[PDB]
Amino acid sequence: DYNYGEALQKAIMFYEFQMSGKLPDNIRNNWRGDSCLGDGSDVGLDLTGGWFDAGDHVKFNLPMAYTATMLAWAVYEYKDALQKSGQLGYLMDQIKWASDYFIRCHPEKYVYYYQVGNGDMDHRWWVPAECIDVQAPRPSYKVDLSNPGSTVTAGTAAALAATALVFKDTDPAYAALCIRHAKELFDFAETTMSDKGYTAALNFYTSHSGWYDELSWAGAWIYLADGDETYLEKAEKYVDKWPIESQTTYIAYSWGHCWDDVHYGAALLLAKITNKSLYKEAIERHLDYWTVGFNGQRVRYTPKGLAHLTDWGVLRHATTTAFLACVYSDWSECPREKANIYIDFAKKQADYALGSSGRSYVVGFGVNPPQHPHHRTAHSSWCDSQKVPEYHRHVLYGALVGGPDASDAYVDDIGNYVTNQVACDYNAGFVGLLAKMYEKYGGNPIPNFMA
Ligand SMILES: OC[C@H]1O[C@@H](O[C@H]2[C@H](O)[C@@H](O)[C@H](O[C@H]3[C@H](O)[C@@H](O)[C@H](O[C@H]4[C@H](O)[C@@H](O)[C@H](O[C@H]5[C@H](O)[C@@H](O)[C@H](O[C@H]6[C@H](O)[C@@H](O)[C@H](O)O[C@@H]6CO)O[C@@H]5CO)O[C@@H]4CO)O[C@@H]3CO)O[C@@H]2CO)[C@H](O)[C@@H](O)[C@@H]1O
Numbered sequence: 001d002y003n004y005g006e007a008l009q010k011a012i013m014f015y016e017f018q019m020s021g022k023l024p025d026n027i028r029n030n031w032r033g034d035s036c037l038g039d040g041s042d043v044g045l046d047l048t049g050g051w052f053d054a055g056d057h058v059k060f061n062l063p064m065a066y067t068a069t070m071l072a073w074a075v076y077e078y079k080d081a082l083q084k085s086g087q088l089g090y091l092m093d094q095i096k097w098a099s100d101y102f103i104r105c106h107p108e109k110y111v112y113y114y115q116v117g118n119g120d121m122d123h124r125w126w127v128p129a130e131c132i133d134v135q136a137p138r139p140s141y142k143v144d145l146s147n148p149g150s151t152v153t154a155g156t157a158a159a160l161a162a163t164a165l166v167f168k169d170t171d172p173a174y175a176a177l178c179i180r181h182a183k184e185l186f187d188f189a190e191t192t193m194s195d196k197g198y199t200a201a202l203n204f205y206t207s208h209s210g211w212y213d214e215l216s217w218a219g220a221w222i223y224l225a226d227g228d229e230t231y232l233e234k235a236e237k238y239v240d241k242w243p244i245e246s247q248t249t250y251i252a253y254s255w256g257h258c259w260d261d262v263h264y265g266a267a268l269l270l271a272k273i274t275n276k277s278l279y280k281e282a283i284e285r286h287l288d289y290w291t292v293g294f295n296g297q298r299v300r301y302t303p304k305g306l307a308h309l310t311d312w313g314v315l316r317h318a319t320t321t322a323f324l325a326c327v328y329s330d331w332s333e334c335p336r337e338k339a340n341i342y343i344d345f346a347k348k349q350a351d352y353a354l355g356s357s358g359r360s361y362v363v364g365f366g367v368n369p370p371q372h373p374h375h376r377t378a379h380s381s382w383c384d385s386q387k388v389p390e391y392h393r394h395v396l397y398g399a400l401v402g403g404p405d406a407s408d409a410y411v412d413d414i415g416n417y418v419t420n421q422v423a424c425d426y427n428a429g430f431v432g433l434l435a436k437m438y439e440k441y442g443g444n445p446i447p448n449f450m451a
Pocket residue numbers: 054055056123124126203204205206208209243255258259260261312313386417421422423
C-alpha cells in the first residue's frame with residue numbers, strides 16, 4: 001500500500017508552513033520567516049502566533065481551534081504510533097503553538113479575541129506572509145459579555161481542554177493552565193448563549209449549526225482532561241439542541257464532522273465516555289450512512305470510490321469522517337461486523353487522498369501531486385499576482401487540497417480556491433487518519449526530512 005509514514009510526516013509538517021509570528025529556531029524549512037509580529041498592537045496585546053487559516057493570512061480562531069482539537073485527538077488515540085513514526089514531537093509542538101495563541105487571545109475571563117486580520121482587505125493582497133503586514137492594517141476582533149460569541153469561545157475551550165489532556169503526562173503546569181482557561185471559556189459561552197458579537201468572520205466562518213454542539217464538544221474534552229463531572233453533565237444536557245436530520249426526529253447523520261458541525265465527534269466521544277445507546281446509535285447511523293447506507297439512503301460516491309459529500313473541501317470531509325471511523329472501529333464496544341466495514345472505508349478514503357485514483361491529492365507526496373495550491377506564501381509572487389511566477393517557488397509539503405468533483409474530475413489551478421484550496425481544517429482529521437493507517441500498515445517516513 002501507500003507509505004503512510006511519509007504521508008503522516010508531511011501532513012504534520014504542513015502546519016509549520018502555516019505558522020504566524022516569531023518562528024522558533026527549531027523549524028525545518030528554510031523559506032518561511034518571521035511574520036505579522038505586530039498582531040494585537042492595535043489593542044495593546046501580544047496576539048502573535050497561531051496559524052494562518054488557509055492560503056491567506058487571516059487568523060480565524062473558530063477553524064483554528066477546531067484544528068487544534070482534532071490534532072490533539074490524533075495524539076490521544078494514536079500516541080504510540082506517532083512516537084514510533086518519529087513525528088510525535090513535531091505534532092505536539094504545533095498543538096502548543098495554537099494553544100499558546102488561544103491563551104494570549106484570552107486576557108480576561110470574559111474577553112476573547114477571535115480574529116486577527118480583516119478578511120476582505122487581507123484577501124486583496126496576493127503577497128507572502130513575510131510581507132503581508134506592510135501592505136494593510138491587521139485589526140483584532142473580540143467578543144465580551146455585551147457582544148458575545150458562544151460558538152468560538154466554546155470551540156476554543158475544546159481546543160485547550162484537549163491540549164491539556166495530551167500534555168498532562170509531559171508538562172503538568174501547562175495542562176493546568178490550559179484547563180483553567182478552558183473552563184473559563186466554557187462558562188463565558190454557556191452564560192451568554194449568543195453569537196451576536198461574532199461578526200468579523202461573517203461570510204468566511206459563519207456558525208450555521210449553533211453553539212450547542214460546541215458546548216457538548218468542549219464539555220466532553222474538559223471531562224476527559226480533568227474528570228470534572230460538572231462538564232460531562234452539561235455536555236449531555238445540550239444534546240437535545242444538536243441538529244436533527246430533516247423530516248425525522250433523529251440526530252443529524254447525513255453531513256459530517258467539520259469546523260461548523262462538531263456534534264458528530266462529540267457523539268463519538270460521549271459514546272466512549274458513557275457507553276449510552278443514544279450516542280452509539282447516533283454515530284453508527286452516521287458511519288452507516290457513509291458506508292453501507294442507512295434506511296435506503298447513502299452518501300454519494302464517485303465511481304472511483306471517494307465519499308463525496310459536497311464540492312467545497314470534499315477531501316477534508318471524507319478524510320475527517322474516515323478518522324472518526326478509525327476511532328470508533330478501534331473501540332471494543334463497536335459491533336465486530338461494523339468495525340471491519342468502517343476501517344475498510346477509512347483505508348479507501350486514505351488511499352484515495354494518497355493516489356488510488358491515479359494521482360495524489362497531497363502536495364509534495366506520491367504520484368503527480370497538486371503543484372499549484374491556492375496559497376500566497378508557497379507561491380511567493382513578487383508583484384501581487386496569482387499568475388507570476390507561473391510555478392510556485394516553494395513546495396507546500398503535506399497539504400491536502402480541496403479535491404475533485406463528483407465524477408473524479410480535477411485539474412491544478414491556482415485560481416480555483418475551491419478545488420485547489422488548502423487549509424488548517426483540511427489537514428486536521430487527515431493527520432489522525434494517517435496515524436491509524438501508519439499503525440496498521442506502516443510505511444516508513446523519510447529519514448532526516450527537511451523542507
Ligand atoms: O446544510 C448543510 C450543512 O451546512 C454546514 O455548514 C457548512 C456551510 O453551509 C458552508 O457554507 C461552509 O462552507 C465553508 C467551507 O467548508 C470552508 O472550507 C470555507 O473556508 C474558506 C474560507 O471561508 C475562505 O475565506 C477562504 O478562501 C478565501 C481565499 O483564501 C482568498 O484567497 C480569496 O480571495 C479572493 C477573493 O475572494 C476574490 O474576491 C478576489 O478577487 O480574489 C481573491 C484572491 O486573489 O477569498 C476566499 C474567500 O472565499 O478559504 C477557506 C478554505 O476553504 O468557508 C466556507 C464558509 O461558507 O461549510 C459548513 C460546514 O460544512 C452545517 O455545519 C451542517 O450542519 C449542515 O447540514
